[PDB]
């Protein structure tokens, strides 16, 4: 019964998009809006309307935008950038209501944790910033010696994940505990940059990470126990992970050379379908909230929009 369209529904320009494997640069908020960042500037595409705005530009020469990361309630946009800001901005208002500054290097990856916004730069440092407060920079989780560029806060709320170009996964707690703000794990398996990073929302502990170019595995892992419960070689590069409770699937975006996403049956890790169509490596995929739809970016300046997983009646 279950029709997956082998197209993408929609596709929309991203005329621009910056080809670093990297950087974050897609989200789709909860009020139905996808964040998308061209070279300096931000747009925004209502995927209910069609309409468009220009969020922002950046003022000075050479600077981009790094990363985006939507509020949970989608009426705010973290924007991380080259000058190693972290801005938020009011998308309704059009305003930025603070740059906020304490890296050292290119902010490329962002999750939220209710007020917490969390960090991710090139220089290996996660910074936790409480938006709220005047001093935001309240913690420094120091476990990378490459660029963050996976970071991911749990549902629950209970651990974050990072992924790095340093070939590790750090599982950190949500507080400082009895070791401080130190990893309560530390995976090493992954031989190639960690920038898939996505926790399963039926499992509380269960966390899925792919790697890169010289590693090509999406691997599962208990992060209580530590174990991995699933390595499985997707035989190509693994940007970017989602999950779905509808059927109970995993989708996955890879580079050369297929170019394509893979939609994986959990907890068996049978592929489901192969979803063709972008011409260079997918960077970036971003779920919509009514779950039936995947945005895929990809170096080939456009975003993908596949209705792979509808609860048709």
């Known amino acids: 019964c279950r029709y997956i369209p082998s197209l993408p529904d929609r596709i929309l320009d991203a005329p621009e998009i910056r080809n670093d494997y990297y950087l974050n640069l897609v989200d789709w908020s909860s009020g139905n809006v996808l964040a998308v960042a061209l070279d300096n500037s931000v747009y925004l595409w209502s995927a209910s309307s069609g309409d ?3 969020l922002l530009q950046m003022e000075q020469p050479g600077e981009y ?4 990361a939507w509020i949970k309630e989608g009426n705010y946009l973290a924007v991380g950038t080259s000058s190693a800001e972290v801005q938020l901005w009011d998308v309704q208002q059009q305003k930025r209501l603070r740059n906020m500054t304490s890296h050292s290097a290119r902010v490329g990856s962002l999750s939220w944790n209710s007020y917490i916004l969390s960090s991710g730069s090139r220089s290996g440092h996660i910074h936790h910033h409480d938006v709220r407060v005047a001093e935001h920079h ?7 010696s490459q660029e963050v560029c996976g970071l991911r806060w749990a549902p629950d709320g209970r651990h974050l994940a990072s992924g790095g170009n340093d070939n590790l996964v750090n599982v950190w707690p949500s507080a400082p505990g009895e070791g401080g703000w130190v990893p309560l794990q530390t995976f090493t398996q992954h031989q190639g940059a960690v920038k898939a990073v996505a ?3 039926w499992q509380s502990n269960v966390l899925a990470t792919g790697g890169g170019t010289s590693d090509r595995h999406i691997r599962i892992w208990n992060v209580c126990s530590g174990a991995c419960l699933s390595a499985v070689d997707a035989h190509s590069q693994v940007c970017s992970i989602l999950w779905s409770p509808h059927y109970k699937e995993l989708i996955s975006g890879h580079g050369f ?7 994986w049956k959990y907890p068996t890790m049978a592929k489901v379908a192969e979803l063709k169509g972008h011409t260079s490596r997918v960077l970036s995929l971003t779920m919509s909230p009514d779950g039936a739809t995947v945005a895929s970016a990809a170096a080939d300046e456009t975003l993908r929009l596949w209705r792979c997983f509808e609860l048709d009646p």
């Open 257 to 263: 050379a297929q170019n394509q996403l893979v939609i």
């Open 52 to 54: 468009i705005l220009q």
């Open 199 to 201: 926790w399963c929302p």
């Open 65 to 68: 935008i790094s990363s985006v």
């Open 138 to 144: 309240v913690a420094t989780l120091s476990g990378h």
